[PDB]
Paper text:
The acyltransferase (AT) domain in PKSs is considered the gatekeeper domain because its function is to recognize a particular thioesterified extender unit with high specificity and to transacylate it onto a downstream acyl carrier protein (ACP) domain. ZMA is a polyketide/nonribosomal peptide hybrid antibiotic produced by [name] strains UW85 and AH1134 that exhibits activity against a variety of Gram-negative and Gram-positive bacteria, as well as certain protists and plant pathogenic fungi. The structure presented here of a hydroxymalonyl-ACP-specific AT expands our understanding of AT domain recognition of ACP-linked extender units.
The crystal structure of the [name]-AT domain, along with its N-terminal ketosynthase (KS)-AT linker, and 20 residue C-terminal post-AT linker, was refined against 1.7 Å resolution X-ray diffraction data. The [name]-AT domain (residues P93-S407) forms an α/β-hydrolase core into which a small subdomain is inserted (residues A226– I292). As is the case with the two KS-AT didomain structures from the DEB PKS, the post-AT linker of [name] (residues D408-P443) wraps around the AT domain and makes extensive contacts with the highly ordered N-terminal KS-AT linker (residues T1-H92). The corresponding residue in our [name]-AT structure, R217, is positioned close to a molecule of formate, which co-crystallized with the protein and presumably mimics the coordinates of the C3 of hydroxymalonate. [name]-AT structure features a hydrophobic patch in this region, instead of the positively charged surface as on the malonyl-CoA specific ATs. Neither *malonyl-CoA nor *(2-RS)-methylmalonyl-CoA was used by [name]-AT, whereas both *malonyl-ZmaD and *methylmalonyl-ZmaD were used to some extent, highlighting the importance of the AT-ACP interaction.
Residue numbers in the entry: 5 to 292, 296 to 443
Write the structure that this text describes.
Amino acid sequence: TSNSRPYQMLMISAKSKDALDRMTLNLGNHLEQNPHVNLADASYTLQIGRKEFKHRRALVCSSTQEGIEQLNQPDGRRVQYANVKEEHPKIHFLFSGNGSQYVNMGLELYEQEAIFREAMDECFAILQSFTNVNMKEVLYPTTFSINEATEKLKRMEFSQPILFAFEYAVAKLLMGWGIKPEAMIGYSFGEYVAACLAEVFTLEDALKLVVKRGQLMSSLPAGVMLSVPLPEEELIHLINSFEKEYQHTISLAVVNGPACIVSGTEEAIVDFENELKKQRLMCMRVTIAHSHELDSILDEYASYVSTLTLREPKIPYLSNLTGTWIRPEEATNPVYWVKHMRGTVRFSDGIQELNRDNTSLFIEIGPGNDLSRLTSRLLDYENGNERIFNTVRSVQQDVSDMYFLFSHITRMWVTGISVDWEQFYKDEKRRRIPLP
């Protein structure tokens, strides 16, 4: 209980950069001079009940020696620094869509963080109760080999509710640390998690809904998705001509600003790729849908959604169908959910609405490097990175999950996002100690 987390964030703030840098160097020297100081107590002393000033520096370490090395170089790029100009920034959660999930994603958070673990275990209990499947064995295998869990995570009736649960739990972890969204937006499937957090549906009904969505989609052959670097109005013209010249349908699946994603069967997409080649246009497959291929399951989906309870949102969020704020009467209409399945995802429109306040800050919930890069570019071509913060590493990134999360929380905090340290320390026994 006096034990602490395996990573520690050190927070320092001051009324000028000069004072901040002197304090940073003083703290480094103090830790070098007393190398047995309790690092968790030092971290706690710098956070708990503390006034936060506008020049801020923060870093992550896992040992006193690592903290010393960083503090001795205050302007080193391992360390985060910013001068807060907006003290109460708008915080937006951005929910990742399907496609980047992997076995054991978030494992260190499941192991270490009570808030996260509790949210995940609630989801696993609800899923087991109505599906009779233990989905924890797939996400965090303790009897299956990773090989077998990976194969089972490829089935949509598993991957969709698992991603949903994971993103829900990440969001509850941040909210449980006092990081609350002023507004939200999902990329495609991510809208379902936004809606649950806005209390459009209960966690139980959301989990039933996404299991049903996954089950229905499992009956569909995989099609293909294709990125085309032209704006919406141009894709509309290309698709219209294509459908009249070939005997195939192409759906405009996603609008991402100056580029769009289209989708269809392999046959349709190969013909479309041929037409693009005739027009000497770039394209690239990006298959991971939102298309004509869903039409045969929509009636059944509509019927199911009609059985759930839908309520008006309590946190505002963007609609992927309309590209603007969801209306109360839209969220509560079962037909909205059916249309959302079939319809174009107006992602760039939603991001443009949020970016009307160009000091707003975005936290990506769930894994997805491509989505983070796209969003950054839509916020600001040179400097969008400074306003987006991630939560989960990509499958191939060999980095600790808690390290990755805390690296981004240190960035959030220096940029002006407050953390409820009382909740952060709710399961530890810490003491304030003397510091320079």
